[PDB]
Design an enzyme around this catalytic site. Sequence first.
Site, PDB file in Angstrom:
ATOM      1  N   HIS A   1       0.896  -0.059 -15.428  1.00  0.00           N
ATOM      2  CA  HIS A   1       1.632   0.002 -14.187  1.00  0.00           C
ATOM      3  C   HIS A   1       1.798   1.557 -13.760  1.00  0.00           C
ATOM      4  CE1 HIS A   1       2.122  -3.996 -15.212  1.00  0.00           C
ATOM      5  NE2 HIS A   1       3.375  -4.134 -15.635  1.00  0.00           N
TER       6      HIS A   1
ATOM      7  N   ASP B   1      -6.275  -5.399  -9.686  1.00  0.00           N
ATOM      8  CA  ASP B   1      -6.223  -6.061 -10.705  1.00  0.00           C
ATOM      9  C   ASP B   1      -6.730  -5.213 -12.082  1.00  0.00           C
ATOM     10  OD1 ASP B   1      -5.782  -8.415 -12.473  1.00  0.00           O
ATOM     11  OD2 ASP B   1      -7.284  -9.492 -11.737  1.00  0.00           O
TER      12      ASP B   1
ATOM     13  N   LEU C   1      -2.960   6.332   9.004  1.00  0.00           N
ATOM     14  CA  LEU C   1      -3.391   5.174   8.441  1.00  0.00           C
ATOM     15  C   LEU C   1      -2.285   4.067   8.427  1.00  0.00           C
ATOM     16  CD1 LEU C   1      -5.701   3.498   6.068  1.00  0.00           C
ATOM     17  CD2 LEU C   1      -4.092   4.605   4.635  1.00  0.00           C
TER      18      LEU C   1
END
Lengths: 218, 217
Positions: free
Chosen positions: A28, A11, A115
């Site tokens: 973005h 955020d 991962l």
Amino acid sequence: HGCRHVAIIMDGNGRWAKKQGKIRAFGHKAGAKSVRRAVSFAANNGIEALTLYAFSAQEVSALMELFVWALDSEVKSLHRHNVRLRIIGDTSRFNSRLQERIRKSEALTAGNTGLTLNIAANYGGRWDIVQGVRQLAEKVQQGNLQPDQIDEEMLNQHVCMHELAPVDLVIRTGGEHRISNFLLWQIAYAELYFTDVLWPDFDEQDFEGALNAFANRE
Amino acid sequence: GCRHVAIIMDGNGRWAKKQGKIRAFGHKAGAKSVRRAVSFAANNGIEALTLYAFSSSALMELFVWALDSEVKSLHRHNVRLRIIGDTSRFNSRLQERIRKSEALTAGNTGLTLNIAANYGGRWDIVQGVRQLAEKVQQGNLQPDQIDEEMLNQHVCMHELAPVDLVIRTGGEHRISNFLLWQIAYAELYFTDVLWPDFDEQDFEGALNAFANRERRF
Ligand SMILES: O=P(O)(O)C(O)(COc1cccc(-c2cccc(-c3ccccc3)c2)c1)P(=O)(O)O
Ligand SMILES: O=P(O)(O)C(O)(COc1cccc(-c2cccc(-c3ccccc3)c2)c1)P(=O)(O)O
Ligand SMILES: O=P(O)(O)C(O)(COc1cccc(-c2cccc(-c3ccccc3)c2)c1)P(=O)(O)O
């Protein structure tokens, strides 16, 4: 660091861009750039799983289509980095195209020893729990399970990310101190780490700050 | 306007040690810290206060005694008492004192004081699930008719204002299986202050913090 699973509520993108005198698009871009940097750090640091959630009616449904479309370009780069991809969220209301486009993805990377990255889309933590409950509701309607048989341990097998290491650490950037209905069930024992830094400025040295904070908070 | 505050009381033992005293000396201070927190919540128009003791037959008896000796006062102060959690394995006397303590003050209009007792957040949700699963067996419910609101009516405190702020004293930053469904939207405030020292000032600042953040976000 004794940290296996990391969940991040991303955020500050919009806020980051405003300060630079720029428009959301630019933010973005910086955000996505920050998403790559965060994953990378996870791989290069033996973290096992990384779960991301972008915090913000018709448009929403569209925005999720842009998301799936973009989530097609980066899949290839992900396989190449030996990453297993999982997509949690309410992808049941999504057209049949994007859904194949999803399992294709999870299929492809499914076998990496790197991962395990999970990306929340149309995800809710109450909904997450709900749909786990619906699966038990079906087993009860069939006639195979007795209500009093349902326990924590059972329901935990029906919520998102059950196959994975439990969440050890939740990091929220951007200054707010709320879970905002992201993981609920899954964070019963997780370390909660909140930071003022806006997502685009969130970097390796910031991801290290949290793992050290977690490691030391033992 | 913070209507419902949830507190995870922690650091009573650590507190004692710091004084170089025994674990029981800290429990004593914690209990005073609880009284002061409840006076404060009530003197300041909070609707509900939810207390969760954090630890890492003697106990069940101090329970009965606390309830016996402290419920008349709560009632005079118009506080409405509730114990949340699994009280099923408690001897019937404790279970009976709890039921009566609640029944005594059920009708008060002051602050509702919810005391977690052998409470767990996942447990809370699971018991709600069990109630719904009975209505699915009873054939009154269909699996795809379950929604967040329905699950919401069977989780603890569904009848009260939503939890706005969760305060955790003692320095750890975890919910530790305390309220889970209920805090999807709550403000989360962590303070290293130890529960026995957590006071009217520490409280005011958590509340202020809530206000400023409620204003910024
Ligand atoms: O390990 P290196 O030093 O080879 C390297 O840092 C690895 O770079 C990546 C590591 C992990 C993940 C990625 C990555 C690339 C492209 C997209 C994404 C991606 C991440 C999250 C969501 C969607 C897409 C991740 C790249 P490089 O810059 O690619 O050489
Ligand atoms: O603070 P906001 O309201 O600007 C927002 O939460 C920012 O959330 C993001 C964080 C990280 C990455 C993204 C993101 C990456 C790539 C594309 C997009 C996107 C593309 C088109 C429209 C909306 C979003 C978002 C979004 P949003 O989802 O873009 O509204
Ligand atoms: O002595 P004061 O001035 O702090 C005052 O008695 C505070 O009044 C209270 C309000 C609400 C609750 C209490 C209270 C008194 C005694 C025990 C408890 C109590 C709290 C928590 C658990 C068990 C008991 C609460 C007191 P008053 O309301 O201002 O008259």
